[model samples]
Target: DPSQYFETRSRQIQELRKTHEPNPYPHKFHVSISNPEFLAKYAHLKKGETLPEEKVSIAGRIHAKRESGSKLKFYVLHGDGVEVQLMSQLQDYCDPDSYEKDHDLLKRGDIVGVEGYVGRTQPKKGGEGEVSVFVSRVQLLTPCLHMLPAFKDQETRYRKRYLDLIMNKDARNRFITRSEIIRYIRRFLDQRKFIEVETPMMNVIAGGATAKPFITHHNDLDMDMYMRIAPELFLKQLVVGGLDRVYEIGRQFRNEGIDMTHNPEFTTCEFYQAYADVYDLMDMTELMFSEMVKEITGSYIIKYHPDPADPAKELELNFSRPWKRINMIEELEKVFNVKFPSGDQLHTAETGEFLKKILVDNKLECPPPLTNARMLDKLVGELEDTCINPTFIFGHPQMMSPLAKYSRDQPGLCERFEVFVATKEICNAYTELNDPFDQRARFEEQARQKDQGDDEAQLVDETFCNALEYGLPPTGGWGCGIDRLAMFLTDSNTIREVLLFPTLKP
Candidate 1:
């Protein structure tokens, strides 16, 4: 089907090029940033006033066009998710013969330059909004070979986004809102004096959060390299190096499955602050999200998108402060009717076998490549269904963390919290492990687990451990997936909806 369409479009474009030129699209005139501005700038002008004495050139794709049996013709110009009307009458600017030839070039999906005096039309059916542009002439900047229908198939639209933008107003607005949301986040953090930083995406060691990495080989160095799973480790190292308020908003790659909410490559914003703890991060995260909701959606609440499984769904989120905080270990015990072991006990491979049986007893299987982290993550995911609203689940066991610091009062517990909304983890934060001794031990524990079959267990990043040896203060660290946040703000059910070009199977 696509081959037939492409062939038809290509042949048509090739044949027409003989008359038009080698390249039809050209930018010669300056225009306003958006069509809305064009409308608003002359809004003061009454219905009859078009300010025709001053000629202006506007550029956009032809959204719709209609041919009249007289000297007059009309085409709608649209760009920046806004519209403008273009009226062409041969008697006003050209002879009828010339106009007839030029009219042949005007078609929907074509990009063109229209120079004209601006004027309002008599309020007519299907043409009521915005002042009209009475075109003196139309330059065929770019001609569309393929016909652009009002709607397109999803695959074709995604594969050819330009066409989608021309045909779909909602998609255009969705992306506009995407950029605004990203800008809002940067400004939100910038106001807090968070120093944005860059971290190495490709590194010798894949040391960060527990995600399978996409590995590559360095030809020059002749060594294996991997994409960083998260910027958590490097950001914490910066905190050790004394950049207290450092943050990184960048892409991270994972050799993981593709799902509604999961993508192999996505964005994350990770920040570290010296002398602060997980509690501070939890509170700060709540504040950031609350403010961002107000800044973007104009309220503390946001309307979530309808699920495909339930088209009539009307879901809303109230991300107000003082969210429910649950202790991870306690929740596990309550759900399974069994107490979890101490952190020290969890640090052993022998204990993993013990937990495996306990996991099976709780009606959840031992996760593939079994490790304490995997077991704990399984428990968290199981419990996630209960966190339908904004909730912070904290107090994870120490073996589950290779970077987070152990609880000072509770010997076996670590000070960590993951914020979840609508049954999905939005962010993970912790009081970082500053002591080199503990850090090394945690790395060794992870290494041992990997040796025993847990492939996702972290490799010991000795350089980071060395940084810890110098001194990483009792700092707070936070990381959230920007894609997930975008999905939340847009009420998108899938991460693919937020991404402009999400990876697909070749």
Candidate 2:
């Protein structure tokens, strides 16, 4: 079916190339106005009314075409999420032969430029009908060779994103909103005088975060390099060099498996502010998210459909300030009714076994190599599913946060907070670990874990340590996955839904 359709359209296109006056695939076409803009400017047109003197030029893809004899034809022109009707009558054109040849040549999905006078068609008994353009000229700008299929497959839609954008208004609007989200973030930070900067994407150690790095070879240097898993270390080094408030919004690569939420290549916005603590970072995050929601949706509340299968089931998320804050140990204690250890006791192999048993007894998966970090992560991650509204879970275990400063009063806990909404992590922030001595100890512990077969264990970077020795002032750091935030804000169910060309199997 597709082959025959393609052949038919191709033959028609070849014939048009031979006979059409204006090139079928033209270099350029000037648009007087967008379809929506023109419609809004001429909304007051009454039925059968025309402004013949006010001619305009517009270009868009033909979404629908209707033929009522050779004398009259109708087309729905679509551009930028709006449709404008085009009414073509042979009598309106000065040359009847030219009108006859060109009027019937336009097809659905063909982009065309037209010159027309604005008007409106006759309405039904009680309703004012569509405002339209009475066309005097038409020139095909681009032709489609294959028939546009009835798009239903998600895989096909993702692989061929242009089709999805053309056919689904929701899909198109979601990406536009995503762009707006990024712009708003930039503006928000810029207003606060945060300098945006770029960082290196390739590194020797990939020391920023605890993730398996994607390795590559640099032929010129004849050295192995890892694609950045996070820009945390480089951003902090900038702070050390006195760029007090700096931020980078960029991509991170991880050699990992894909899931509903995880993608191998993802975007993260990481910022560091001098002389701030986890508490200050939390305040900023709450203000930014609440204000961002109000700006994007015009309210502090949004309707989120949690299950893709049952889209009718909606849940409301309120982005109001003073979101619930819970201590990680306290919540875990309440959920499991067990006293979590502290200080050196928490990092012992015995404690790891204890937590592993708890996970098993609770019917949770405790896959190994079961280090204290993995066990604690598994236990704490269970609580995220219940975070329907915006929530901050703070006081993470020291083993779980190697890059965060230890809590002043709470032993074995770090000054870290992760924001969760609708069971997804929206942000992670902490008072950064700047003490070179403590950092080296943490790195050694991580090296030990790597020796024990934890592939995600963070490797030590001598350059990062040397930069810290040059002194990084008391600073707060924050990292948020841009893709994940886009997903949560747009109500997309999977990371792939928000990604334009998501990784796919060939």
Q: What range of 10 consecutive residues in model 2 has the weakest lDDT sum?
A: 122-131
- Would you list the clashing residue pairs of candidate 2? none
1-506 per-residue lDDT for model 2 (tens digits): 88997898888788868976646788888899988899998998877788888888899998899988768989999887999999889877766779977866677899999988888888567567788888889888899787886567888887889989888777988888888888888997899899999999988878778888888999998999999999999999999999999999989898889987888998889999999999899999989989998999899998888787998988888899889999998889899987877655788988978898898898889688888888888888789989988999999877778889989999788999999988889888999999999999888888888888898988688999999999999999999988987887898888899898998866
TM-score between candidate 2 and the true structure: 0.97
Candidate 1 deviates by what RMSD? Answer: 2.8
User: What is the TM-score of candidate 1?
Assistant: 0.91
Candidates' TM-scores? 0.91, 0.97
List, residue by residue over 67-118, the lDDT tens digit for candidate 1. 7786778899886667888888876664555677677756677888777787
Clashing pairs in 1: 24-141, 25-141, 50-119
Q: Which regions of candidate 1 fall more than 4 Å away from where they truly are?
A: 1-27, 30-34, 94-97, 124-130, 150-152, 342-362
Ten contiguous residues with the weakest lDDT in model 1: 20-29
What Cα-based lDDT does every candidate model obtain?
0.78, 0.87
Off by over 4 Å in 2: 18-22, 124-126
